[PDB]
Design a protein around this ligand. Sequence first.
Ligand SMILES: Nc1ncnc2c([C@@H]3O[C@H](CO)[C@@H](O)[C@H]3O)n[nH]c12
Ligand SMILES: Nc1ncnc2c([C@@H]3O[C@H](CO)[C@@H](O)[C@H]3O)n[nH]c12
Ligand SMILES: Nc1ncnc2c([C@@H]3O[C@H](CO)[C@@H](O)[C@H]3O)n[nH]c12
Ligand SMILES: Nc1ncnc2c([C@@H]3O[C@H](CO)[C@@H](O)[C@H]3O)n[nH]c12
Lengths: 237, 237, 237, 224, 237, 237
Amino acid sequence: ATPHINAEMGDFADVVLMPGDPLRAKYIAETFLEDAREVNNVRGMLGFTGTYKGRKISVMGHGMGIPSCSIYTKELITDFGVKKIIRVGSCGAVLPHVKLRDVVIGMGACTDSKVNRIRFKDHDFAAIADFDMVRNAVDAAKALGIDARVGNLFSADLFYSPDGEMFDVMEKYGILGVEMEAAGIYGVAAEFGAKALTICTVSAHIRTHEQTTAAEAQTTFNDMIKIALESVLLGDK
Amino acid sequence: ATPHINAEMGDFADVVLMPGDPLRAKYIAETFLEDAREVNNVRGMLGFTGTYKGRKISVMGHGMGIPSCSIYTKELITDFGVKKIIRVGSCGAVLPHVKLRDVVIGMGACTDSKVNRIRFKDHDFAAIADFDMVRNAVDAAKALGIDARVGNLFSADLFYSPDGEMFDVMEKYGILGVEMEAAGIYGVAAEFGAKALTICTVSAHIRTHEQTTAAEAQTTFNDMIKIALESVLLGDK
Amino acid sequence: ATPHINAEMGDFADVVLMPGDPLRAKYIAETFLEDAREVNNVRGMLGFTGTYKGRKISVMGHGMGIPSCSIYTKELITDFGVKKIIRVGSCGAVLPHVKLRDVVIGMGACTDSKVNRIRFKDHDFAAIADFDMVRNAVDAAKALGIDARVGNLFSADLFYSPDGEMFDVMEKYGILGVEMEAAGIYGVAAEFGAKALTICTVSAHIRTHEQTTAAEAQTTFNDMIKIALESVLLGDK
Amino acid sequence: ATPHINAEMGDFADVVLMPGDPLRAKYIAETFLEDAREVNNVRGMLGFTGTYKGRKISVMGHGMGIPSCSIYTKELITDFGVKKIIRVGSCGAVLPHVKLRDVVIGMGACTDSKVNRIRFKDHDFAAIADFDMVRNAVDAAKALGIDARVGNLFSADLFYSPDGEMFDVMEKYGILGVEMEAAGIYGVAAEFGAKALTICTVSAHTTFNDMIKIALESVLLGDK
Amino acid sequence: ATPHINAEMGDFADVVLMPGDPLRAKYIAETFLEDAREVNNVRGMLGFTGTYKGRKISVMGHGMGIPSCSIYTKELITDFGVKKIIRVGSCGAVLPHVKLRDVVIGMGACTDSKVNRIRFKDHDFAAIADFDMVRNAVDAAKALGIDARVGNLFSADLFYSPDGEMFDVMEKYGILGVEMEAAGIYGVAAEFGAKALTICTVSAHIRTHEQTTAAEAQTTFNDMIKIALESVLLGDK
Amino acid sequence: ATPHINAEMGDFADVVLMPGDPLRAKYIAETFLEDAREVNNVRGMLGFTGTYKGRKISVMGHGMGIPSCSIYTKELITDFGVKKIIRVGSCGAVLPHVKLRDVVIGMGACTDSKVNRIRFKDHDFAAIADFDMVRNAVDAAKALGIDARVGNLFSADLFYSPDGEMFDVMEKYGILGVEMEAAGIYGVAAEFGAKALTICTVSAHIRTHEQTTAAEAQTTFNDMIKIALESVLLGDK
Ligand SMILES: Nc1ncnc2c([C@@H]3O[C@H](CO)[C@@H](O)[C@H]3O)n[nH]c12
Ligand SMILES: Nc1ncnc2c([C@@H]3O[C@H](CO)[C@@H](O)[C@H]3O)n[nH]c12
Ligand SMILES: Nc1ncnc2c([C@@H]3O[C@H](CO)[C@@H](O)[C@H]3O)n[nH]c12
Ligand SMILES: Nc1ncnc2c([C@@H]3O[C@H](CO)[C@@H](O)[C@H]3O)n[nH]c12
């Protein structure tokens, strides 16, 4: 019923978890949700709806990059009644003791994209998460006994940057993770009046060159998923 | 001492409340702090240190504008061991449900200043507060029975803007209050590795034209001060 | 292998056709390639290698947006020996005489992305195709009796743009189609020293609602694939 | 009254000298003016009015940075009938043959602020002083046996630069001094149809009293 | 007549060759055109019209820099019925394997000018040549036994640049030649609805600081003019 | 000789007057200079040297636009010992009260060119004249009973600008005349350590104003040149 999602109103829950990888979305649905049913396959960007401890929850890929996730998050918000989006992604670390598989929560997201300047008359829009969603994730992580650091992400347009110097700048300003979506989703949420949060798992260290495998990112970043799901239940009250 | 502060290490607490108005700092010191003493008067930018419920706390003006407060925040952090800065300011509102004297908490701060682009290689730095400090303010406000919205501020360089239409864009994107400092303080905090939070009292409504007096701003915005002070105690645990 | 491609040197031909939709990649492999073998499925971004009239050819999706396709095209070039990339996508028209099903070839690509400014010290980089590839496509098109316009595409970051006025500007400057990838692929081609071409078919007329049948669309899609495939054989000499 | 100035029309002369430091405004008032009276104290930004050689003159601090002085200069111009603003400040010098107690007059003011780009559709606005005021200041200095240097200032947003990249660039293109207000004041003057001048004493690489005399005497030359 | 051209409709052919130096336009007229007559001398910017192999052809200087050539090209288009402009110039090489005397055809033109951003709402306009004119020039060069390079020029505002590093950037993204006009002409052609092409001969290597001799300069210049003229004939078919 | 001036050290005086039109330089030489002779004709950019009231003076065209005049002024300063450049041109007025044939002295020059941002690390360089030169010109005019207007010029890159509304902004900020060179000449003067001034006579009113223009002055084109020449004699004292 939308140009990139073959589904109808009601097919999605009012909260959607979104990794960039549709195969991770499939894994999450098969592993964490009961009675999961596929609700989208357009362009292979798989989305599912099921229950978690009785709560109706959806999970769907958003693809890589600001332009990709801006399409899907917009369509979910304006045409599927989605009120909350929780991005559950991977990121690269620049800080010395942020390590592989650490969970980080993006209360804010820097970017080298032009999308928000386009929205905001070429000034600086502070791309931020919903505060209550941030707090729910923090509280859920505490209850699960999982460490999670809250701060700034950097949403990059170029995974392969010609400007390695920017990584030193990011590190100097305390950037917790480099990914490619948070700032765009946060812009969409502000534009169309919904609520968003990005939680990432560290899948690479940009300095040490340590990194997980594609298979590991697809199916073993479960801490962030437990946090995301439990945080929804806290949100419901 | 530093070029704009004639004091020595120890004269300031590790937390400093900062309004733009040094006369407001003085009122706060005389009204909320016991055994208050003047620790700065360079350029008339009054700063005081005293105790609040046994806790050593400072309050000092930072002047109007990003370049003004950038100077004071830098100097406090590098030379006076300051770890937390709570800006306690005034702001104008654009949103139709935001009222005069409402308290707003700036989890993020947008800006039309160039200073963060200067820091961040001409990219978008998301100028954000420290998460724990935001939560401390929210919890303290709740305990006090004082309402407070958490969200984005906009830090303007021009109080008298030629671009009146930018207010519609701010309103569209949910900006809670227009002030002149938060994004600057947040960038300095990130640069020099400290923590910061801006809490503001709505002193004018840009749509309804309602406005408090200069006298009222100087001495009567006490809800935000109570919140800030109690938030520090929560932060100490 | 790379983080985004689970294959090794040799799995890909030195020419790769890329639609945005990985399911179209599978379609192309099944319909126009002989002895097609799937060589990638990381993140569900299907890629296949086979032969067309004896010539080894690969086809793989690139996802939506400049950041997505920039990852895949970079990795193909630096790690898989890929010499030529031909994007085969869809676009929206703004010109009155450009009709649904028309084939456009992007000799250049305008953009509102910041990726090329990041590469090019904030100056104007003209994102352009390889001339021989453009010529090969024009000649292949002629031999199949298919008309094609050659000129500028516009690669947009925001499918749902808040700036409707920009479409008038694109029309005024002769933009043939609006898509979301070409300028990004062309920047990668220049950065890493390879050759690229984007060919699109018009699937929408922006400022209407007009569409064709799923049949007219498939036939037209097929026409583009044939132009792309025949253009490669011409390039081989 | 305005949100930042507790006074009424007539409380200010039509010319206002403005140092950054309000305590320096007080000093100027007490030292050079007859019958000096405090006319503003909102936010502690002290302003005074009195007479210099029979001529009504006001002096008021403008605070540090473009945003601060933009508020005060605008309000003076639009709400208190002020026609001329003379900033009297300090600056740091980058040029070798520009000396450690020299008086420089900013005929132009560079900046890394975005405020004039906001005013001028993201093009380059040459932030300039009023020419007659520059002339009056040069002649006033000359009559006092001071050769003031006239040229470009640089108005910085960041007193504490993250990288200091601009210092060599300022030296290369002949900037006479570095301060934090001129480009802002000149933008306000252009936007609201008034006249402005910034005069600075090179504080780093009296003197102070000399600069003030120059400013005041330049007003009297302007009156003729 | 127009403010910088004292001539009337008909005085120019529908195609105009344009060197920067008006004295070179005079040489071209005298050397290559039959029955050449001078049709402009305003500001000393000599223009001539005559025939080449029976075909009416004009040649006129455009002066140095984007602002200068933008004036002349605009006026020819809106008031003299000119359809095609061929800039014929010299350029400096940055690439090690681009040699003195090489012929470069600018299918695209990069620039550090702001003129196209002014036209294109501060986004990236890809300043491109007309495709048929590019192909006509390649084919004409081939028939003359010359292999021209086709790619990007860079059009600089500053002949004497203070930013030496930009040349490294140009070299990195494969710029074929540096001159001062192409991007401006391409911008005018798109704005006013005409066709343009820039052909240059490399007369300098920016790194080696080598410089073509006068004898080879005259030779390769003549080759460039032959290519331009014969390309017009090819285009007429 | 320099790449654009076929002359030797000594052929030029240490002060050079520059109109845009080389034929105008010719006119100035013949009308005002004694024993004038041609010192350059490269690209038809005529330069002459002679005496005015015993004072050795030169006059040479600079062509149209910032990039053209930037080339000539640089070379004169670095290779011909030129100390002062006085541009003598025409300009268009945007203020209704400015008169036809009024003389405008550009103490400053705004621009939409990027050349000074390239020099000044993307910040705002105030392109200004030499103060003594400005005063000399003011005094010279006054002596001849002409009240010259002293303030900002605007140096445009596009004589045919697509942004008519920018002229409203110029009027609002008090711009006295629109031309195409001053800001560039001032940038070169500061870059290479020389002194410059632009003097213009108003030759048109730009755009239609409700008001009605003041009137028209009795001042002549020759009057402007005299002011320029006389201003040099004052400078000599
Ligand atoms: N070191 C890194 N840099 C940038 N992005 C990523 C990611 C995420 O994975 C994708 C790119 O691999 C994209 O969606 C991004 O958000 N993981 N590790 C990353
Ligand atoms: N409506 C409004 N707009 C902008 N700033 C302010 C303020 C704050 O007060 C000062 C200007 O009045 C400055 O510090 C700014 O942050 N109060 N009301 C405001
Ligand atoms: N009218 C339009 N605008 C933008 N993109 C597209 C496309 C292509 O389809 C995808 C988005 O639907 C993306 O890859 C884009 O290049 N088809 N029609 C389009
Ligand atoms: N070397 C220097 N750099 C920046 N600002 C200043 C000043 C002025 O002093 C204040 C900062 O101390 C501010 O008003 C600025 O304009 N004096 N010397 C300076």
